[model samples]
Target: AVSKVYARSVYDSRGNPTVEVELTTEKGVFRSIVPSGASTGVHEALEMRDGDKSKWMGKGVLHAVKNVNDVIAPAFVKANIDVKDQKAVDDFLISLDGTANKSKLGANAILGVSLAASRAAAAEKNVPLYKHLADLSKSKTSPYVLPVPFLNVLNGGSHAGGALALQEFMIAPTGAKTFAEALRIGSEVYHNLKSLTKKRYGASAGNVGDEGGVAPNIQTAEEALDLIVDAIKAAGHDGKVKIGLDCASSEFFKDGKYDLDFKNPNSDKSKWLTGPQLADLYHSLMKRYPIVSIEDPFAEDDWEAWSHFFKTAGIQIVADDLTVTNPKRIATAIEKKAADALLLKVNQIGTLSESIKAAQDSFAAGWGVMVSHRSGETEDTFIADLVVGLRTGQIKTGAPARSERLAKLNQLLRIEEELGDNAVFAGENFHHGDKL
Candidate 1:
């Protein structure tokens, strides 16, 4: 059997560069591994096809690739050595590559793919996907979440907005803790802002943006910090809440927002904190209550900032946009001492397998993982299961669209029940270091 494997680069609907790798046999059947997203490059699902066409056989975000080794060349040679029909030989080669991904495809779908390549070598080629599934189930546990009261400290992100949508639509049967507190503080917050979501929407609020109160772009770093801190405190968290900050590489002071001619030394950014600013923030807050994790305390491109935060903050400085869920970038963060933890999103790396690698590697390096949700979401409980199955801490979701996030919490609750109260929603220092 003859095999041709190639990787192709393509732009997505938004003109971002992505890749699709294909392995084909002479019999016209082929398989392609594709990824999605730009914020860190996602590798979500795999599509396998036969007869020269490509179609997704199964899809899930939690698939893993062991690695593409060069040793498979002889395996293909052995399969076709005695085969008389060239088409059969071609089918054999295509089947090998297909079987590889298929076997490793754990219950990414409701079922999984399993079957060792050695059997294919032994010439028993008609293995059912279900049997492959049987072996897949052997080592696979389900993805789920805990059913505790959902508490979210929103800081201008997408899923946070969706959470609001869920609240409005009554999507989550469970209740929200921050929503009531937000409504109280929001009255004061909206009064200070020009945008009033309630007045504009005529009472039909869809997303967080619809309310226009989630994340109004701040002109100064102080303003951003104050908003987050106030939001935290107003929720009755006050010094008790530990906050995570995300400054996604928009380094206006140096990287490009510089128009020095018109820029003022005492302007909004001059006093604006840089990497040192975050270091000070952490040090100062650490004295008060419990300020644990800080996400993207530096810009995505600023490894120096992350290194500083990790060294000085005495907190689990997390890398989100910095690592973008890519293991390679995560490795860079490890090398630079950028973060103490990773915010794991299946979408961030595009596939479950890739996400697992990042999680495993980060864990190996002594970093914790917080399995997170996206701005745009479906009620896919994969993340919930992942968090429980892997025993993750911290889920960053907001009030409102509760289905996706709630599903996870609910799943966790179930586990806690079965575990006989061993399960607990890990709480943080609402008053980080205030009294001292």
Candidate 2:
């Protein structure tokens, strides 16, 4: 039984106010924080922002907090739903919202309660949170699988002030034998990348991005990929850490064509790459570099391009903006064969149960699932357990730089140590490790 529920406005990694929840149960009080996304999908659940200009530049979350305190908190306690039965609790939340996207109560309001209740249930079971999550998700805990960390070492697009168009230039330690080794490779490669960027373009060019990835003022994708290659070789992790590009194409998918130089004010429309032309560029890059993954290679609504590219991309074509972590969208994507993987972000769907179900649905379609942290993050490490418990075999939580980002990776390290010999790192089979 849930004793009480409380809501508080807390600041996230980006220094923006977000919702945090405290749910009291027999065991104790359990807490959870919400993460935000800058390049959010159109179909994503409402985060319920308080549109007050004076408050945090119109990003205040007080209304969302109020929604929790005034509505969700009181009703949830009175409902007396068992915390252990996550689905029933979540269904009740859905019932209360009575909206397609949980817009009535705000997804943030419902999400806070959802996460906190799950935490309380984990405590009730007297097991680690990951184990509880595994039980709730019906994901087997034995021979626990650790994900290949897709460490974001560089940033562009809306997340960074740069001529580069791509949102994230990540490195996946696909050759690592263990999760700890993967972390070491990531940290070393990150340092090397930072050093090279500073030497090539002076000090300020290496300023960190929103996700703590170094944002160098580079223009072309080749230049960024070349620099990453140099960094990998410098760190003596060449071929061990494979490149992963998150185009976040929706950010640059202006008008009709894909603008590779959308950062420029008067960018030439003729210079913009067509969907087919962009596909050619990706194929060329894949041939030259050990590029194992590409995310949102086409615009969110560019269904034609998605189906065309997925047939031949060969690597993991993750659907982030395309699917928005929504089950209906996922079903559409799977039927069309639009993407090969799902980029699972909890806030996108606004509930743990939905996020887990999304991963299961993705796995059912033979699609890879890469649990991710949003651009605006928190110190909370729920996603750390999510990636491991669900055995997704892939996760990207930003560079191991900022505390908010490292919190997840650090949590994973502890889980790795805890799992010991029972763990398996998703190195080579990073995409569909669950099926294996």
Candidate 3:
């Protein structure tokens, strides 16, 4: 039975307040912290925050903290832990919220407790969190795979104060044999990128952005991709590392149109590319660079453009804003054949049940699932075990520079080490080859 539950506000990597929760069972105590997002999708579950502008510039999570302490806590105080059935506990929390998007008790609050409950159960079972989650996922027979790390080496859009419209330009070390080796390859490339940026764009270009990607003074997305490819080659990992792009196109979408003219931001409204041009742009980039993935290449609502791109683009076209990790949205995208991959973000759907279901459905449909982290993240490292537990072959945790991003990578490395012979590196299996 649950003996105690506690919730408090804690600072995230961005120095913003977020919710932290602790759950105490008869066996032991377990704690968890929730992460925040900066460039969030409109369809994502609402992350409740205090609207009192006077406190923390309206970013305070005090209301979410209280919702956990006073509301979520009492609901499960003396109840059985229900460790074996995560969905049962999560469903109760969802019913208690009684909202479409878990807005009532706050996803931040509910997720904090939800994660803690699982941790507490894992402790009682005397098993690793990943193993426990794998069992819970009903895939214990499948070998644990270390996800291929997608290291974001360049930042644009909301993630950085740069002019480039592309939000993230990443490198995936597809040739690495192990998780540690992949990290080394990515870190070396990141260092090479820093040196190249300093030499080309001066010292200021080496500044790290929110996700630890270099915010160089690049003029266009092509320039960023070129530099990244050059960095990989310079680091002696040419074919080993491939490129990935998170277009975050919704940021540039306005008035039913798409814009890629980042140089002349305020100059011409007519310079924006139409739907067909945007698709061609993506196609050209895929052909030009060793780009393997393009996320949200079109605006969230631009289903027609998404379908067109999916038909033409040979690379893995992923959906983030288009689906928001919701099953209904995922189903719609599948019905329309709009995407080849799903970007799995737990907070996007506000519960592990929903997030797992999305991944399950995506995998069942032979689509790739890439577990991702938010721009505004914490040192939780919960996602590390999640990636292994869910058996998602891909993981995008930003660059290997920041502590918040590295925390996940480091945890994965530890799991890989612990598993030893049992550990399976995704390697070439990261992106579902020929399946897309």
Cα lDDT tens digits, model 2, 1-436, are 7989999999999899999999998889999999988999988998898889987889998888888889888898898999999899889888889998888888889888999888998898898898888888888767888999999999999889978889999999999999999999999999999999999989997889999999988988899999999999999998788999899999888766888877888978777988999999999999999999999999888998999989998888999999999998999999999998999998888888898899989999989999999999999999999888788889989998999999999999999999998889989988987754
Candidate 3 residue runs with Cα over 4 Å from true position: 140-142, 262-265, 433-436
Predicted structure 3: lDDT: 0.86
Model 3 deviation from the true structure expressed as Cα RMSD, one decimal place:
1.8
What TM-score against the true fold does each predicted structure earn? 0.50, 0.98, 0.97
**Model 2: number of clashes?**
0
lDDT of 1 by residue, 1-436 (tens): 4354333334322232333333444443333223232223222233221222232323222123212223233454445443223234334443554542233322121011111221232233453222222132222223122322223433332222221111111011111233223233423332332233233333333233321234332233344445445444444434333334443333223652321111233444444445675466557645753345556555667667667567656666667777866788888889998786787775444344456667778777777776665443333344544554444445554333245445545555444556443333333311110100
- State the lDDT of candidate 3 residue by residue for 10-115, as single tens digits: 8988899988898888888788888888778899888998988999999998999998889888877756548657899888889989999887887888888888
Query: Could you tally the backbone clashes for each prediction?
Result: 49, 0, 0
What's model 3's lDDT at 307?
A: 90
RMSD of each: 12.4, 0.9, 1.8
If both were scored by TM-score, which would come out higher, candidate 2 or candidate 3?
Answer: 2
C-alpha lDDT score of every prediction, in listed order: 0.41, 0.90, 0.86
Question: How are the candidates ranked when ordered by lDDT, highest leading?
Answer: 2, 3, 1
